[PDB]
Design a binder for this molecule. Structure first.
Ligand SMILES: N[C@@H](CCC(=O)N[C@@H](CS)C(=O)NCC(=O)O)C(=O)O
Ligand SMILES: N[C@@H](CCC(=O)N[C@@H](CS)C(=O)NCC(=O)O)C(=O)O
Ligand SMILES: [Mg+2]
Ligand SMILES: [Mg+2]
Lengths: 198, 198
């Protein structure tokens, strides 16, 4: 159909949707909002947040709800209902952590304090658990890629911008990034996407 | 098959799973752990958090992933893939907001100030968006109940503990929670469940 993605000019919370469109070879409009235009756009959206995805005029919201929609009936979702649950759960574990960062906090001293606590004290526990769950499997679920693996590439890319040595203990998690990035459609998207900090 | 739900003796993040089991008439073990026994249990769980659900020898985690698993192929999920997206999205919008509350904060002055700000300043924006989305529909999605409606009853029950007058000006949201509570399986569970603050 006709797809229009609306987000800021960032990877951020839209990037999972962008990976899925690339992987499934689905054409879409990648509409990027400049910051100064956001007050104009915000009241037009159902819950006042981005990303949203318009599908033939119907506006969907919530990045992970949308990602899950786009992967319905594909192997990327998980091949069984139990595996779909495992995929969903890894995604929400990652998203829970990323959602703790006070990205819009105005007080920079409090913002940095929270970022530091998250990156220094809390992140090692997440990483240990992700690495234990992955084990020596090829991908999070087993022997095939799912959108949870995509979400790890995306989240880790941003965490690495914030803390460049983040993955220094976990080469299996690095190998997982490398495997996702080597998928030809993903590799091509990474080469062509706008270079933004976040 | 030997469904065993592990959580604290609270509604909290297990309650959505408990509503779904009630509605679908699925027998399960509702295992509640006292705070004192949590330190020994925590390291045995792949991601160190509760709730978890034991299902066919697997330990599933993430309350909403588990809820989605239990509702797969039922009308509670949403009947079409677009409706499933809308259900998923309302649930994540609610969960995003409830996750802002610093439930585990030990500085009680800070906790109270944050709670009060959320309830006073932020909640009207969320509640307006939810009320507007519901409109005059019978249920969030339209003409049938979904687990998004359940999640509204669950979230709102705790919000009303925190601020009894909160829904005074949202009669449609009051009506929705009353409609959910009047579903016989939900009524039965509400009458049976342990009385806890949260
Ligand atoms: N869990 C939601 C979060 C949506 C969200 O909060 N998006 C931010 C931008 S990353 C936003 O729109 N913030 C409100 C604002 O800036 O007015 C999702 O993944 O879609
Ligand atoms: N988004 C997760 C959150 C899970 C979570 O954070 N659970 C808390 C209890 S409500 C926990 O286990 N905290 C860690 C601890 O208490 O050690 C879910 O809905 O399952
Ligand atoms: Mg979430
Ligand atoms: Mg009505």
């Amino acid at each position: 159909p006709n797809y229009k993605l609306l987000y800021f000019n960032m990877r951020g919370r839209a990037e999972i949707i962008r990976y899925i469109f690339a992987y499934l070879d689905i054409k879409y409009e990648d509409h990027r909002i400049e910051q100064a235009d956001w007050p104009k756009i915000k009241p037009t959206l159902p819950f006042g947040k981005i990303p949203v995805l318009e599908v033939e005029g119907l506006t969907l919201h919530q990045s992970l709800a949308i990602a899950r929609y786009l992967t319905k009936n594909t192997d990327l979702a998980g091949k069984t209902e139990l595996e779909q649950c495992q995929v969903d759960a890894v995604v929400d574990t990652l998203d829970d952590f990323m959602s703790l960062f006070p990205w819009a906090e105005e007080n920079q001293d409090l913002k940095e304090r929270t970022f530091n606590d998250l990156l220094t004290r809390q992140a090692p526990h997440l990483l240990k658990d992700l690495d234990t769950y992955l084990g020596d499997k090829e991908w999070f679920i087993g022997n095939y890629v799912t959108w949870a693996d995509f979400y790890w590439d995306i989240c880790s890319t941003t965490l690495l911008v914030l803390k460049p040595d983040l993955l220094g203990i976990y080469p299996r998690l690095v190998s997982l990034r490398n495997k996702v990035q080597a998928i030809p459609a993903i590799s091509a998207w990474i080469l062509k996407r706008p270079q933004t900090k976040l």
